[PDB]
Design a protein around this ligand. Sequence first.
Ligand SMILES: O=C(/C=C/C=C/c1ccc2c(c1)OCO2)N1CCCCC1
Ligand SMILES: *[C@@H]1O[C@H](CO)[C@@H](O)[C@H](O)[C@H]1NC(C)=O
Length: 343
Amino acid sequence: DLRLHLLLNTSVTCNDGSPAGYYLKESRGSRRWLLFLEGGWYCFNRENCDSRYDTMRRLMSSRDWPRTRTGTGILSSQPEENPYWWNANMVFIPYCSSDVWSGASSKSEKNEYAFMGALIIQEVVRELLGRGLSGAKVLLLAGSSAGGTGVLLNVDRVAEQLEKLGYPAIQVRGLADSGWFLDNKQYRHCAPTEAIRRGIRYWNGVVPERCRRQFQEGEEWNCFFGYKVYPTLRSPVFVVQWLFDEAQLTVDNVHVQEGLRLYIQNLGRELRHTLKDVPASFAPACLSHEIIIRSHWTDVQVKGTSLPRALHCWDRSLHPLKGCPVHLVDSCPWPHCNPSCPT
Ligand SMILES: O=C(/C=C/C=C/c1ccc2c(c1)OCO2)N1CCCCC1
Ligand SMILES: *[C@@H]1O[C@H](CO)[C@@H](O)[C@H](O)[C@H]1NC(C)=O
């Protein structure tokens, strides 16, 4: 089990002003650290954040969090369930800021809610340095769904923070799961581009510096889209993305005749195209919302290679490799054309 620690700097808060936190299981002797960002959509104005507070309060507040959680999938400490990093130090960071991990704004007389996702990540890293992270060789910042987009937004800032604090030997890397979205046309027609544009203003959202300098003021929403922000990043990032992701289809208003068949096939081709120049990637031809912290994450294969194997080959590459591939993108054009897709 992973044990809850609420942040000692109680000014770094969840949406409602309660302290943010992290769950930790230490592994003495290991110099690998895995920090995982939870997902769960977002909210972008007073009215829709008020609704989220009524029926999704654990995503806005720490008041009801449990004292422990069980690590599963890539967060499991059992080699049978996690062939990749079962002996690592494990950290689960709850998503309680509703801002795709981008915010830097406190609750005040002008702000009903605090949006502090970017500061939560920084404060967790700072407090872990005194709990063993100072001795790390690799820090892998991972995350699923909104947490996967959060990895893309924050991995280079973690690297810069550790350099400025005097720890240049820790190698910072990212693993973005299910957070690589397209700003495409909907099948029928608040779209993500508009909702994110409003969210950035409401959250005081921040984006990576090189991407910000390309797109400039008013256009920072572009940096929330993986294919646009990825080429600006300096840290190594492994991208996991279903070709027919259910959250992508939801925002596209897809819930089969010729028009819809062509729409779905074109979506898969577009996603494949955006990954052509991403050297470390795993993209199966499945319709799914399943994520890498699920217990059976080992079961899916692309071209005969599982995700835990691909991640191990990635580790070796950062020391091509015979029989140890890292670029695994399906080419078949319809969901479940890969027989290993989740049931
Ligand atoms: O958190 C999510 C999905 C969140 C999607 C977040 C998101 C959607 C569109 C975007 C974006 C981020 O930036 C670029 O455009 N879940 C979906 C399925 C599993 C439950 C959680
Ligand atoms: C607490 O966090 C806030 C926001 O990141 C920061 O301004 C302040 O310096 C922090 N204080 C300490 C003692 O870490």
